[PDB]
Write a protein that binds this ligand. Structure first.
Ligand SMILES: [Ca+2]
Ligand SMILES: [Ca+2]
Lengths: 367, 367
DNA sequence: AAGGGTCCGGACCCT
DNA sequence: AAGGGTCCGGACCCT
């Protein structure tokens, strides 16, 4: 499908929001601490040595100047996330969210309208905004190249708007599919954008050194592949489809092999309003007594403020537990009286607990 | 919630469609045969002795005049079903479908608009269309009674339209919830309608003799209840909520006990377009060889015509098997090339079969 | 960590 | 029979 897909990857999001919140934090190594880990850091801290998911103490030693603002409360990050998605939705309605820092948009229709409102007497001037992957030559005669070049311009527009309206810096990637767009978005990582012309897809797919770097292949699938002997993209591309279907399933095998060739027909989805609101707390086997009710109590109060703000209402509640040894869950439709609050809720949640390192409450079935 | 819900139950649907298809079949005992069973019969055959789900031969003996048109192809029944749902949707958009003979509609908004466009100087004339359950007295002073009486009139309008436009006879039931509406729709069964006023809900709930007659309680739940000793509605109403939650689950226990009191907050849903298209064939251990591919082949061709007609397209395929001994299933996303046909499809379906009295093919994930 | 999303196969219900 | 629908808990993915 001749599609133009854009991937928007914001740089150090949690940190960028914290730096905007306290100007002083600007031009200073900043790390976002979650429990015992530094989940995100500014480029300055990365430069001095701080890395993602690093022990906080090791970091403050490698970077004694590391100011560490806590980020276990994701409320302000979530607010800016939806502000970014909303700006992008004004450009085109269908925006898919991946986490809070990434967004996908299909610019195909927008590209076509701009290309029709144009005259071929100005085609020699359709110019690229940003880097072209593999310094590939542009052919202003190939329609595909022109469409992707228009997407490059819309991406530059989206990025300038995100800075001018939300003060946020980010990277962009324009391609024919979501996989290629996400993979090209980080070729130039600090506040830059890259477009992948069709004749350079194989260079990007073979640029990867681990199959886990392919979006869609995680720990389990990769372990299965490594055991079959597949450690390269070419290995997955050249492996027998039949054996892979037999050991992984027809669905996973066909999709993952297509990804090895840079093929993804996945439609860009409209994520729209959130479908779940959850809150959790991590602990060191600190829950060995039904006193875990106290933890569930705190989690409920916090999540309650969030569901109050949305306006839509929850109809199913879920308790997710993490034992030390893999997360089990038990859900129940919320009684209507409660839908119209803590004591009834804790009673239901405790019954779910009794039927079943981490405790989580989730409000789903939102209407 | 002060709601007005209507249940539309068409009389002997399959048979009514067959009688419309062959006028001659009118005023003659008619039975719809499916394999070895008579799934539906006209009232004339019911009068002579024919019953639902009866051996065809036993029926043709009790009623030697029974003309039996085959109804294993549900295409014409399905077409009339959506014609009925569409007529009802013109009255109000939210229409829920239960099978092909039943529809639920929320008339609350319609009732309110008509009641506002009315003057209290004409309230003494709001009259009921159809029977009132338990010959309950109408109180034109209770707003609830007035709202349900308006629903009675809209139901009579819907029924007259179904006869005048589709030549179909049916029964209707107006109440505050879907359970009470479905339960009151059949008090007067031949082409009649009944309204349940609020002070008569307990009479209807206690009118039932088996808890399985309660919509929502099937074989499994009823067996569990019978083992706990619950065989009456009063038994379920008076049983300990706690023990029921322990043996059946918090969700089922709370909902089924509310149903025992005639309580159902279930929202009337807009069923809208179909979400699945399936075809199956029942056989006497006639599939003991991979030759079952031949059966899957026929099923596919048939279902293909149906998916061609819808206009929306399938994205996931499912193979459902019934062994003699409980239906297992294996699904796979359909390759995009096929989505844009028999040989590729049978190959995927055979792989699903090899991974796994009845064989069924289902086209779901429709977009 | 601290969230958040689809897919899937079964159980159960209904006609 | 011959269809058709939600609920659910887990696996797996992503940030
Ligand atoms: Ca980064
Ligand atoms: Ca009947």
């Amino acid at each position: 499908s001749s599609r133009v897909i854009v991937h928007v990857d914001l740089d150090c999001f949690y940190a960028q929001v914290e730096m905007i919140s306290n100007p002083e934090l600007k031009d200073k190594p900043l790390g976002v601490q979650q429990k015992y880990l530094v989940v995100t850091c500014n480029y300055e801290a990365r430069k001095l040595g701080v890395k993602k998911l690093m022990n906080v103490r090791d970091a403050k030693e490698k970077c004694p100047q590391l100011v560490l603002v806590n980020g276990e409360d994701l409320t302000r990050y979530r607010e800016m996330s939806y502000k970014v998605t909303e700006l992008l939705e004004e450009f085109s309605p269908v925006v898919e969210r991946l986490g809070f820092d990434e967004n996908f948009v299909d610019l195909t229709e927008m590209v076509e309208k701009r290309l029709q409102q144009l005259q071929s007497d100005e085609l020699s001037a359709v110019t690229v905004s940003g880097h072209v992957y593999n310094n590939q030559s542009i052919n202003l005669l190939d329609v595909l190249h022109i469409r992707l070049l228009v997407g490059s311009q819309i991406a530059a527009e989206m990025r300038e708007a995100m800075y001018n309206q939300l003060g946020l810096t980010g990277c962009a990637g324009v391609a024919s599919n979501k996989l290629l767009a996400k993979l090209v978005s980080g070729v130039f990582k600090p506040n830059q954008q890259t477009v992948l012309l069709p004749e350079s897809c194989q260079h990007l797919i073979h640029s990867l050194n681990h199959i886990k770097e392919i979006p869609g292949i995680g720990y389990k699938t990769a372990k299965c592949l490594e055991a079959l002997g597949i450690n390269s993209v070419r290995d997955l591309q050249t492996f027998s489809p039949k054996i892979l279907e037999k050991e992984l399933g027809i669905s996973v095998a066909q999709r993952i092999q297509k990804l090895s060739f840079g093929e993804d027909n996945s439609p860009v989805i409209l994520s729209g309003p959130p479908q779940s609101f959850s809150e959790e707390d991590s602990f060191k086997k600190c829950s060995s007594e039904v006193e875990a009710k106290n933890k569930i109590e705190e989690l409920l109060a916090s999540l309650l403020n969030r569901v109050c703000q949305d306006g839509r209402k929850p109809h199913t509640v879920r308790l997710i537990i993490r034992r030390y040894s893999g997360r089990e869950s038990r859900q129940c439709p919320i009684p209507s009286h409660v839908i119209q609050v803590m004591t009834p809720m804790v009673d239901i949640l405790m019954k779910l607990f009794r039927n079943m390192t981490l405790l989580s409450v989730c409000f789903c079935n939102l209407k």
